[PDB]
Design a binder for this molecule. Structure first.
Ligand code: BCL
Ligand code: BCL
Ligand code: BCL
Ligand code: BCL
Ligand code: BCL
Ligand SMILES: CC(C)=CCC/C(C)=C\CC/C(C)=C/CC/C(C)=C\CC/C(C)=C/CC/C(C)=C/CC/C(C)=C/CC/C(C)=C/CC1=C(C)C(=O)c2ccccc2C1=O
Ligand SMILES: COC1=C(OC)C(=O)C(C/C=C(\C)CC/C=C(\C)CC/C=C(\C)CC/C=C(\C)CC/C=C(\C)CC/C=C(\C)CC/C=C(\C)CCC=C(C)C)=C(C)C1=O
Ligand SMILES: CCCCCC/C=C\CCCCCCCCCC(=O)O[C@H](COC(=O)CCCCCCCCCCCCCCC)COP(=O)(O)OC[C@@H](O)CO
Ligand SMILES: CCCCCC/C=C\CCCCCCCCCC(=O)O[C@H](COC(=O)CCCCCCCCCCCCCCC)COP(=O)(O)OC[C@@H](O)CO
Ligand SMILES: CCCCCC/C=C\CCCCCCCCCC(=O)O[C@H](COC(=O)CCCCCCCCCCCCCCC)COP(=O)(O)OC[C@@H](O)CO
Ligand SMILES: COC(C)(C)CCC/C(C)=C/C=C/C(C)=C/C=C/C(C)=C/C=C\C=C(C)\C=C\C=C(C)\C=C\C=C(/C)CCCC(C)(C)OC
Ligand SMILES: [Ca+2]
Ligand SMILES: [Ca+2]
Ligand SMILES: [Ca+2]
Ligand SMILES: [Ca+2]
Ligand SMILES: [Fe+3]
Ligand SMILES: [Mg+2]
Lengths: 73, 272, 318, 257, 43, 66, 78, 72, 72, 43, 44, 42
């Protein structure tokens, strides 16, 4: 309860500006990394075709289907 | 023969073994204990290579070959005609190379200078010992080393390379090749720059250090300096040798698949 | 032990040096010079300024157009995904046209982008050549750095433009990748029967080994007499001191002959250039004159002949 | 037929010969450039006579360096300045025998303590100013903090004794870097030591000079003017420190094993 | 001690305009995302 | 490499029968396709190239193994 | 207007450097667009209009990568 | 709620010009990156053939069809 | 505020260099132009090879002169 | 302190012309996109 | 202090006049080339 | 005078430069007329 009293003196031996820059840069790098790690797993939310598959939706439009039919002849 | 300025530097002392008995010159060469050793071992090794050519099928210079023992000999002693001659010659070779390095140390001590050149030579020696001693011992047989012959050690290099399906994907091999290429580039630029500064455009004065800095800062934006390029040079050559030794100690003892399959650790990181 | 002179123990700063004055009519130098403490541990600490004139801007426009093209095709080969780009980066590449197209200009996604990138990279290197020449000549120095650069450019153009034209196909040239260009190296050795029996390849390997040997020797020797002021080579050349004397006695005593403080730099020049000259000569003859280097070496009495003991039956003869 | 031969002579063969001849010819020219320093050499004859020989291939014709700031012309290969006055005794009666110094080995200028005879002018910058100067003449330099400033430290001398104290730093204006340390010795003279023979310990605040002993710092050569140094003086100073690598202790020149 | 030479008044001024600009930028971002959700919803 | 070689029937050989330029018109790309198929032969059996070749001449039948 | 003082631009941007940039960029862009248009269906050198001038191959397939080096020149692949 | 009072003093220890340049460059890089990441997924909007496929539209123009008939 | 919030904005050029900014903007715009054109040309929206309004290689292969020459 | 040497009047002048130029550029961009949407709609 | 090119305001006005004239002429020629190309081989 | 030429020298150079460029372009046009007569490409 009284163990952490002098803690504010930390900034008399550690430079505040260097520390701020280090923290900011590390946080941005970690943000990018965790997003990339989750995107490469089963939890991926861009390619999961939920709530609908859009490439599949484009392949089966009636106009595209009718044009692909008139090429088989 | 002596140079114009040579006589005042030919003093006694500076030796490691021997003493005053072998401290003389023969012509321009300095002899020493290790000079006697080196010439002894070089002569013996050469004569044994020649005899091993005499008992073979041809004395054509390109087709001579003395081969190591079979893998069934293990780390033992092979018959003279089926491997033992190779072992005697490979003892002579080590003796000669180490003698060469120690003679260099004696000379540098006599002239009052630092031991950088024998130290850099030590890494060539280390690569040779990796190929003939360390890798064979770890794999369990002398018959894993290369034969002595132009054109015939190249067949060894080829087949050993293809024992891993594609040896270009060896990582330490890539790193060593990087150092070799950069070393040739650096040597070309250094040679060119010094020649250019003491051989200026017709009817001009010899240039200075400021010119040397300016030219590379104009072309590239950074100049390393006249003493640091010598350092950079020692560094690139030594590193080339070092990573060659590592790449060979990895192949066989620590990796037996194809070399492309090692790299598979990278796209399998769980972070993409 | 004694100080080895590998790192700078004490550093000193003065205001940045702008550079030797250029001839009148020149453009100013761009950039304000900065200092690096870590670069100063091993060498000179100043970075910049830089000279950008006419030839070094055209170069740098060409080169960056080429880089954009190469990068975008590598990125299209994974479906535009940057995550996959980083994941499989050493396996990606921009590939040359299919060999059946000959020397024509193929469509853009079947080899035309390769052709574009090759053209722009070529122009970049020739403009850079002119820059290097003029920069050395405007300060009043000999143009020795342009001769070696010319040799290197010639090797880049030989494998890539001259040999593919003499063969009749752009598909004989390397692609732009890391593992892809290593695959090209191995395949061209396999197709034309073993580069170890190419004699120009052996000679260039001799000179690459020699470059490493010579530069270890020179770097060592000058660091070993830097206590007598040996790192200042211009003064040791125009007024020979004790550093040069000791440096030349060392090699004379050790191997029986020596060079001087100026001549060793000519040995360096030549050892670096013969490597690439033999590179050009070995590639230019492969395919156009010789079809199997091993059979050539056998015809000229070079290859060893291992004992046989067996008989293998060629099944195309049966 | 797998190895059929049509014709023995081809282009690869001729080109290889041409290369053998193009090498073999740059060797010739480089070996000739190698002999612009130190030649003609001196060959000692059957009974002691010395002649000048020139080698294979022969020496080239002289070329001229034009030095800047009216620093004169240098012809090479050309004349030589006269050696000073070293004394030496041969040890064994044959041309290839070694030599011993006659007097005090430290003050003799033979062996690793030999030096060259250069000009008595300083090395110049591109503007005409002297290149190596003390940091009080070059008023724009500063030691980077993060680095131990050697001014004030002591100069322990390889046997544990004290040599003196560092009082100045000598810098190089053409390439900014430290070249010499100036120190006051035991008899109150000002002597220089090259920075490449000094191990600087910041916490002990010492400079260890392994070359010579502590009492040896009294006999280091001195300068004329202390605002500059000339080529000759550089050589003398450095050579004195290099003589100690073999002559400081009587056991240094005496076969390790 | 590391300092930027700005007084406290200059810092107040800079801070005012910085916060205004950042707020406007984030507003535009929100608008872009509402349009994208209306066109092609991704969750 | 299985579509052209193990279902289609294409020529695997790429090297020449003499030392100078002759009627051989194979390319480096065809050499790469062959190299790919050989890599699969090695993996499928647990061996190297030298189980059936001497690398210094991959095309000579008198320098192969049984 | 709002563009009344634009000519003062050249008081802090060097006109020599500006010219050297613009000339280089325009020439390089010219070369680039020509090569891009030639590598498409709009190509005008080998399109057979108004006539095919070369002795082209009578049956030229669609070229694949696993191909040999061609024996004769040909410029009609389509 | 008065915990963020002295926040404006941030610019007395952090350089405003460096910060501005860093922010701008980072924003441009992130813009390019996110556009490329979303274009390489199922959400791709350039190649999805919506609202119509244009290469397919060009292959079935009556002029091109009549020319391809007369060749074959 | 909400209306007086952007008042001192013109002072921006007392801390940001105008020359560097101008050069950066111009170069970035050229690079982005090249990039977007190349990305759109590599999709279904390609406008050089779509054979609209007509296919020109096909048009050249079916000229009567070329047809009569190919017939022999 | 980091500074560009421009006074406040010079900054006002530069800002005026900069904003005018940027507005004109964005106008031209919008026009190009309207034409492209009329010719080949992509969404 | 501030970055300058040494041109006065009169020199800048002169340069600007000729620069704008040249750019206008160049763009005119470009438009003409494209009208000819559209007449010969329309691409849209 | 960043090139050291006065205004008279610049006028002189410009005169001859323009004449030379016109002659060169004339020769180019002639070459293209011959090529069109021999092998028309459009
Ligand atoms: C199919 C074969 C594989 C291949 C299989 C191998 C194998 C197998 C090896 C290498 C090794 C090397 N390969 Mg590889 N390599 C391939 C393709 C390449 C390519 C290329 C462009 O494709 C390059 C650039 C290289 C480059 C290299 C170097 C990294 C390395 C050789 C330098 C070395 O060993 O120094 C070290 C120096 C020595 C061993 C010299 C010893 C010096 C001695 C002490 C002094 C001798 C003095 C003498 C007797 C005195 C004569 C005196 C006279 C009086 C003059 N390889 C292909 C893919 N490669 C070698 C290696 O890394 O070994 C460590 C090695 O074993
Ligand atoms: C399915 C995905 C959607 C899509 C969903 C989104 C979403 C969601 C967003 C964008 C945003 C952007 N999109 Mg979008 N976008 C699509 C397709 C495109 C295509 C194309 C070729 O297909 C292009 C070229 C763009 C381009 C753009 C940029 C205008 C903007 C990125 C700004 C930036 O990075 O600034 C970063 C650089 C700086 C901040 C430097 C500072 C410079 C100063 C402030 C001036 C910059 C001007 C700025 C670029 C634009 C302001 C516009 C004006 C009010 C006119 N999009 C497709 C259809 N797009 C972002 C945006 O709108 O920001 C508000 C955004 O949040
Ligand atoms: C299917 C897609 C459409 C297409 C859709 C678009 C869209 C959408 C846009 C363009 C834009 C451009 N397109 Mg387009 N474009 C197509 C095909 C082409 C082809 C071709 C060979 O096929 C070419 C060569 C071009 C070329 C161009 C450039 C003019 C312009 C990019 C300018 C730039 O990068 O400024 C970078 C340089 C600077 C910022 C520096 C200052 C500018 C300088 C002084 C002048 C540059 C030219 C200027 C804008 C025009 C002349 C001045 C005016 C006549 C007054 N397009 C096809 C047909 N294109 C962009 C544009 O025009 O914006 C204006 C744009 O938004
Ligand atoms: C199917 C496509 C068409 C085609 C469509 C177009 C279109 C569209 C254009 C060109 C343009 C050009 N075409 Mg074309 N062109 C075709 C076939 C060719 C062939 C050939 C081998 O087939 C050649 C060699 C050319 C060559 C040329 C150049 C004359 C010109 C490019 C100028 C330049 O690069 O900027 C160089 C620019 C500079 C150095 C900066 C500004 C120039 C200043 C004033 C100084 C330079 C001197 C002088 C003016 C240089 C140009 C000479 C003329 C007088 C214009 N075309 C085919 C038939 N071509 C461009 C053009 O006409 O520009 C007016 C253009 O817009
Ligand atoms: C089917 C295509 C045609 C063809 C179509 C064209 C067309 C169209 C052109 C050429 C042009 C040239 N052609 Mg052609 N050409 C063909 C086949 C050839 C063959 C050959 C081996 O087949 C050769 C060697 C040539 C060579 C030449 C050059 C003479 C000329 C380019 C000169 C140059 O680059 O100046 C670059 C160097 C400079 C500008 C330096 C500056 C001036 C210098 C100091 C003076 C040099 C003089 C110059 C060479 C002309 C001298 C002639 C005298 C006036 C009598 N052509 C085929 C048959 N050719 C161009 C030309 O003739 O320009 C007028 C041209 O427009
Ligand atoms: C073998 C036999 C029959 C012996 C009988 C003879 C008897 C009885 C005894 C003789 C006594 C003794 C002990 C002799 C030993 C010597 C023998 C026999 C053989 C060794 C010879 C030998 C190993 C030579 C190899 C030479 C080669 C190929 C060198 C490769 C590198 C090369 C080409 C270098 C050329 C460039 C040179 C000269 C570099 C050196 C050099 C460098 C590197 C500098 O940095 C430098 C800096 C400043 C000034 C000068 C120099 C300088 O000269
Ligand atoms: C006479 O002195 C000289 C100089 O000083 C005046 C130079 O600046 C220079 C120019 C040299 C440079 C600008 C430095 C060149 C830098 C190189 C080659 C970088 C290579 C170093 C590395 C550590 C990269 C290797 C790293 C991995 C393989 C990992 C030369 C050549 C010179 O000779
Ligand atoms: C420093 C580099 C190596 C350090 C790592 C050593 C660690 C492991 C090495 C042991 C692996 C050896 C290979 C085992 C597989 C091959 C079979 C083999 O040989 O392994 C054993 C031998 O181990 C042996 O030497 C073991 C000998 C190891 C001694 C190493 C010490 C080197 C010091 C010498 C310096 C002088 C079994 O021997 P045998 O079959 O009875 O011998 C029969 C034939 O050799 C001769 O007729
Ligand atoms: C394998 C085993 C078998 C091989 C060899 C064994 C037999 C041969 C033995 C020969 C070895 C000789 C080495 C001698 C040595 O080890 O020298 C040592 C230092 O050398 C030195 O590290 C020199 C250090 C140079 C290092 C170069 C590294 C370059 C780093 C560059 C980094 C910067 C990056 C680029 C800019 C110690 O020397 P000193 O104490 O200063 O001497 C003073 C007196 O004692 C002299 O008598
Ligand atoms: C009306 C039109 C307005 C044009 C006015 C500008 C005149 C044309 C350029 C001027 C020029 O040609 O100058 C040359 C620039 O070369 C350069 O661009 C060289 C680049 C020109 C070509 C760019 C595209 C490259 C073409 C392909 C590659 C050629 C490869 C040849 C290499 C050996 C030389 O530059 P500097 O000596 O450093 O400059 C000094 C003073 O002139 C200016 O301070
Ligand atoms: C995502 O990335 C972005 C877009 C943001 C940019 C980033 C860029 C990156 C990451 C690039 C990575 C690049 C890499 C790894 C490149 C690897 C390159 C290597 C190792 C290349 C090795 C060899 C290639 C060679 C030797 C090519 C030689 C080609 C030549 C000489 C071409 C000659 C063609 C000519 C002269 C043109 C003739 C055309 C014409 C018109 C005359 O034909 C008739
Ligand atoms: Ca989803
Ligand atoms: Ca046509
Ligand atoms: Ca769409
Ligand atoms: Ca179209
Ligand atoms: Fe050197
Ligand atoms: Mg490939």
């Amino acid at each position: 309860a009284k163990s952490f009293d002098g803690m504010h003196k930390l900034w008399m031996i550690m430079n505040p500006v260097s520390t701020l820059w280090a923290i900011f840069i590390f946080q941005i790098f970690l943000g990018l990394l965790i997003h990339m790690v989750v995107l490469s797993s089963d939890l991926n939310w861009h390619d999961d075709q939920i709530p609908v598959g859009y490439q599949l939706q484009g392949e089966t439009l009636p106009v595209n289907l009718e044009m692909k039919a008139a090429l088989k002849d | 023969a002596l140079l114009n300025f040579e006589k005042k530097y030919r003093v006694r002392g500076g030796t490691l073994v021997g003493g005053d008995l072998f401290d003389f010159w023969v012509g321009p060469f300095y002899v020493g204990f290790f000079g006697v050793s080196a010439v002894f071992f070089a002569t013996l090794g050469t004569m044994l290579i020649l005899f091993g050519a005499a008992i073979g099928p041809t004395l054509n210079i390109w087709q001579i070959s003395i081969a190591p023992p079979d893998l069934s000999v293990g780390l033992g002693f092979a018959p003279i005609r089926e491997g033992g001659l190779w072992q005697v010659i490979t003892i002579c070779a080590v003796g000669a190379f180490v003698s060469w390095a120690l003679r260099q140390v004696e000379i540098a001590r006599k002239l009052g200078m630092g031991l950088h050149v024998p130290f850099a030579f030590s890494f060539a020696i280390l690569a040779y010992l990796t190929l003939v001693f360390f890798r064979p011992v770890l794999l369990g047989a002398w018959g894993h080393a290369f034969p002595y012959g132009l054109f015939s050690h190249l067949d060894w290099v080829s087949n050993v390379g293809y024992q891993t399906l594609h040896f270009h994907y060896n990582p330490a091999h890539m790193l060593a090749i990087s150092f070799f290429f950069i070393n040739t580039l650096a040597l070309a630029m250094h040679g060119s720059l010094i020649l250019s500064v003491v051989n200026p455009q017709k009817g001009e004065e010899v240039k200075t250090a400021e010119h040397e800095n300016t030219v590379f800062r104009d072309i590239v934006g950074y100049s390393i300096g006249a003493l640091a390029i010598h350092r950079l040079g020692l560094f690139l050559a030594i590193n080339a040798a070092f990573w060659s030794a590592v790449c060979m100690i990895l192949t066989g003892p620590f990796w037996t698949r194809g070399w492309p399959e090692w790299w598979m650790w990278w796209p399998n990181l769980p972070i993409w | 032990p004694e100080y080895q002179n590998i790192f700078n123990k004490v550093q000193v700063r003065e205001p940045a040096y702008p550079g030797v004055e250029l001839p009148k009519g020149s453009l100013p130098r761009v950039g304000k010079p900065i200092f690096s403490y870590w670069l100063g541990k091993i060498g000179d600490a100043q970075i910049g300024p830089l000279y950008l004139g006419g030839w070094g801007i055209a170069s740098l426009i060409s080169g960056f157009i080429a880089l954009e093209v190469i990068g975008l095709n590598m990125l299209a080969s994974v479906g535009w995904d940057p995550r996959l780009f980083l994941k499989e980066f050493f396996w990606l590449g921009l590939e040359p046209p299919p060999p059946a197209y000959g020397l024509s200009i193929p469509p853009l996604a079947e080899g035309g982008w390769w052709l574009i990138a090759g053209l722009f990279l070529t122009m970049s290197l020739l403009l850079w050549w002119v820059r290097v020449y003029k920069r050395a000549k405007d300060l009043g120095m000999g143009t020795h750095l342009s001769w070696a650069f010319a040799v290197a450019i010639l090797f880049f153009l030989t494998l890539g433009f001259i040999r593919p034209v003499l063969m009749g196909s752009w598909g004989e040239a390397p692609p732009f990748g890391i593992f892809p260009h290593l695959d090209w190296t191995a395949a061209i050795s396999i197709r034309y029967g073993n580069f170890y029996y190419n004699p120009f390849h052996g000679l260039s390997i001799a000179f690459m080994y020699g470059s490493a040997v010579l530069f270890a020797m020179h770097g060592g020797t000058i660091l070993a007499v830097s206590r007598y002021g040996g790192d200042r080579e211009i003064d040791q050349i125009t007024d020979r001191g004790t550093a040069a004397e000791r440096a030349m006695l060392f090699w004379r005593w050790c191997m029986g002959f020596n060079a001087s403080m100026e001549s060793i730099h000519r040995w360096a020049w030549w050892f670096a250039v013969f490597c690439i000259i033999n590179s050009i000569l070995g590639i230019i003859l492969t395919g156009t004159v010789v079809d199997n280097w091993y059979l050539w070496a056998v015809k000229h009495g070079v290859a060893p002949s291992y004992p046989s003991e067996l008989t293998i039956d060629n099944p195309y003869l049966t | 037929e797998f190895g059929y031969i049509t014709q023995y002579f081809d282009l690869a063969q001729v080109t290889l010969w041409a290369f053998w001849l193009s090498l073999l010819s740059v060797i010739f020219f480089n070996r000739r450039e190698d002999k612009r320093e130190g030649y003609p050499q001196e060959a000692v004859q059957i009974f002691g006579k010395t002649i000048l020989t020139e080698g294979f291939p022969f020496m080239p014709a002289p070329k001229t360096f034009k030095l800047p700031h009216n620093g004169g012309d240098v012809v090479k290969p050309g004349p030589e300045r006269p050696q000073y006055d070293f004394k030496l005794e041969q040890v064994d009666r044959f041309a290839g025998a070694a030599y011993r110094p006659v007097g005090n080995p430290m003050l003799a200028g033979v062996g690793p303590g030999a030096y060259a005879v250069r000009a008595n002018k300083p090395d110049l910058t591109n503007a005409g100013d002297p290149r190596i100067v003390p940091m009080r003449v070059a008023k724009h330099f500063a030691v980077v903090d993060k680095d131990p400033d050697p001014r004030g430290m002591t100069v322990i001398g390889a046997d544990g004794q004290v040599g003196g104290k560092v009082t100045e730093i000598w810098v190089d204006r053409a390439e900014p870097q430290v070249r010499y340390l100036e120190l006051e010795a035991g008899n109150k003279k000002k002597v220089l030591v090259p920075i490449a023979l000094c191990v600087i310990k910041g916490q002990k605040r010492e400079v260890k000079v392994r070359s010579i002993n502590g009492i040896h710092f009294n006999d280091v050569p001195t300068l004329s003017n202390y605002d500059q140094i000339t080529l000759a003086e550089e050589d003398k100073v450095s050579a004195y420190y290099g003589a100690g690598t073999l002559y400081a202790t009587p056991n240094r020149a005496e076969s390790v094993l | 001690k590391s300092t930027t030479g700005l007084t406290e008044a200059e810092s107040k001024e800079f801070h005012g305009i910085f916060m205004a600009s950042m707020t406007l930028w984030f507003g535009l971002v929100v608008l872009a995302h509402i349009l994208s959700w209306l066109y092609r919803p991704w969750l | 490499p299985f579509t052209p070689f193990l279902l289609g029937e294409n020529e695997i050989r790429v090297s020449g029968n003499t030392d100078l330029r002759n009627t051989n018109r194979k390319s480096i790309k065809q050499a790469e396709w062959t190299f790919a198929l050989m890599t699969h032969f090695s993996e499928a059996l647990g061996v190297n190239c030298t189980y059936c070749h001497n690398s210094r001449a991959f095309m000579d039948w008198n320098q192969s193994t049984p | 207007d709002n563009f009344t003082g634009t000519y003062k631009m050249w008081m802090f941007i060097d006109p020599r450097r500006a010219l050297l940039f613009i000339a280089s960029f325009q020439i390089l862009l010219g070369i680039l667009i020509h090569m891009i248009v030639l590598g498409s269906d709009l190509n005008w050198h080998s399109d057979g209009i108004p006539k095919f001038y070369f002795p082209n191959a009578a049956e030229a397939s669609a070229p694949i990568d696993m191909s040999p080096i061609p024996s004769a020149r040909n410029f009609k692949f389509d």
